[PDB]
Ligand binder design. Structure first.
Ligand SMILES: [Ca+2]
Length: 223
């Protein structure tokens, strides 16, 4: 997260870290046994880390659970990142509390102008690299579809939306991928891609979770 603020330990209880020896992506706990992330985050040997603030320090509220199954969306295209969404089942159900909580899926697609919260452990710089240990948070509006397609000619699909600021300075970034975009208490997006980070006229592009609710629900019900 570039240009954000420190969230506070466990203030974002649905945020998760995907770990394969090291943090490489974020995710969202949507029930006690399932996590949503970005398909381009796929790899084998994932351990899901719930309850994290400093991902380099055991602080007391962590739950470390291995994945038993990863399900990339059937129509994921790694060239275009269309349908950048993946489901992860935990080997064991998490223990849900104040600090480890699921986030609800949407009944409705959120509209442009809605303010949302983005979070993750990604790069905090637009030029160069400095990765934080504690969770970073960004409030940002969904941008209209027209602005989004204007900034990214020929690249936005019905399954993506832009959020952020055309002026630059505030954005998600590398290492935030897979993480949550929450609007009015609902998971509306997944950190997916962008042209650099926090550049002007290059806002962040997010998977549009409101299109995948039925796939998520019938996938969870059969696995
Ligand atoms: Ca920790």
């Amino acid at each position: 997260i570039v240009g954000g603020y420190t969230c506070g330990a466990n203030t974002v209880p649905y945020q998760v870290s995907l770990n394969s020896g090291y943090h490489f992506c974020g995710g969202s706990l949507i029930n006690s046994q399932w996590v949503v992330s970005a398909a381009h985050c796929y790899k084998s040997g994932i351990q899901v880390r719930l309850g994290e603030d400093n991902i380099n320090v055991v602080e007391g509220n962590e739950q470390f659970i291995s994945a038993s199954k990863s399900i990339v969306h059937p129509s994921y295209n790694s060239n275009t990142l269309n349908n950048d969404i993946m489901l992860i089942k935990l080997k064991s159900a998490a223990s849900l509390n104040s600090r480890v909580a699921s986030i609800s899926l949407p009944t409705s697609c959120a509209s442009a102008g809605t303010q949302c919260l983005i979070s993750g452990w990604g790069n905090t710089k637009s030029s160069g690299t400095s990765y934080p240990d504690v969770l970073k948070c960004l409030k940002a509006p969904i941008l209209s579809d027209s602005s989004c397609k204007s900034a990214y000619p020929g690249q936005i699909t019905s399954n993506m939306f832009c959020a952020g600021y055309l002026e630059g300075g505030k954005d998600s970034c590398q290492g935030d991928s897979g993480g949550p975009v929450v609007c009015s208490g609902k998971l509306q997006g997944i950190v997916s891609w962008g042209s650099g980070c926090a550049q002007k006229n290059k806002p962040g592009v997010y998977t549009k979770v409101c299109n995948y609710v039925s796939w998520i629900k019938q996938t969870i019900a059969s696995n």
